[PDB]
Amino acid sequence: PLESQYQVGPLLGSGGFGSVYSGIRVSDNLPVAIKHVEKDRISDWGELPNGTRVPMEVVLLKKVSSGFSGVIRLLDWFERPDSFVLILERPEPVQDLFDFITERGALQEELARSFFWQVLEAVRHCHNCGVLHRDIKDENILIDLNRGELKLIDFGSGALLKDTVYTDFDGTRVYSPPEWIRYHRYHGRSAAVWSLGILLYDMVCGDIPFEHDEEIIRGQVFFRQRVSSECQHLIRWCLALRPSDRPTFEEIQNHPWMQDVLLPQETAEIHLH
Ligand SMILES: c1cncc(-c2nc3ccccc3[nH]2)c1
Numbered sequence: 001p002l003e004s005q006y007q008v009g010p011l012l013g014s015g016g017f018g019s020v021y022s023g024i025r026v027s028d029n030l031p032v033a034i035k036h037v038e039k040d041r042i043s044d045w046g047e048l049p050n051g052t053r054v055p056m057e058v059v060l061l062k063k064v065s066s067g068f069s070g071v072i073r074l075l076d077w078f079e080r081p082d083s084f085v086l087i088l089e090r091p092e093p094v095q096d097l098f099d100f101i102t103e104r105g106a107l108q109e110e111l112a113r114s115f116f117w118q119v120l121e122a123v124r125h126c127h128n129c130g131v132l133h134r135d136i137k138d139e140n141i142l143i144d145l146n147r148g149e150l151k152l153i154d155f156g157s158g159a160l161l162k163d164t165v166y167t168d169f170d171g172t173r174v175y176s177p178p179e180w181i182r183y184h185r186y187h188g189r190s191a192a193v194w195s196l197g198i199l200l201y202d203m204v205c206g207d208i209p210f211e212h213d214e215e216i217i218r219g220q221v222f223f224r225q226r227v228s229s230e231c232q233h234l235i236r237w238c239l240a241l242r243p244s245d246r247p248t249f250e251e252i253q254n255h256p257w258m259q260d261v262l263l264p265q266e267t268a269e270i271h272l273h
Pocket of ligand 1: 012013017020032033035072088089090091094142153154155156
């Protein structure tokens with residue numbers, strides 16, 4: 001069983017998402033993360049291609065868990081009487097982007113460009129797989145420090161991607177768009193672009209741009225750090241008040257600020273090693 005298959009290490013974190021432990025798969029010593037989610041705390045349920053009742057998080061992880069290393073892979077899952085247990089891949093050494101920015105401050109634009117580009121490729125992979133993450137933020141991005149590769153984590157607030165309006169949201173409010181704050185309605189892709197604008201500002205400024213609902217609604221972007229005109233333009237574009245005024249993923253990646261991105265290995269060599 002699960003208890004014999006894995007060696008439980010220390011607690012990595014806990015919160016709204018449940019409890020995550022560091023672990024090692026006993027068969028090949030593979031580093032893993034073991035996430036426990038209480039059944040009474042799971043509101044969104046779904047079903048696998050076969051039809052088993054599992055948390056939506058398990059459905060979304062299976063839809064995205066393949067070759068591409070930009071999303072944390074689900075290796076296995078187990079059902080207990082009062083909880084679900086998820087076995088996830090674990091990079092080592094690792095640091096989440098929130099801890100990284102907290103320690104190092106505002107990122108050099110070359111580093112933010114490499115990181116932001118990788119988040120964009122990871123989000124495009126999710127959307128291509130029919131998955132909307134809904135909680136893109138620094139805390140949900142892991143940095144594989146040796147490879148300079150970023151990985152999206154925590155699909156616990158996610159949903160299947162659709163072209164119609166969403167009227168439910170349980171992600172992070174300070175990353176949520178003005179249409180959600182004002183109308184409790186949003187479309188998946190343009191809400192994801194707004195959160196990406198919040199994240200890019202966070203990378204280049206060292207903190208998020210808005211704290212209160214009133215600021216999100218006003219959408220006036222003030223730069224507290226020295227940021228290039230091209231980067232400021234891209235941020236202000238992702239943070240357009242009208243969802244239809246926001247760039248598509250293609251327009252973000254074709255933006256002049258996004259040109260000449262470093263490869264992840266070059267990024268680790270210059271900025272992380
Ligand atoms: C919050 C919510 N859901 C999952 C996590 C999570 N997954 C991980 C995978 C590897 C290492 C650390 C990890 N932390 C954190």
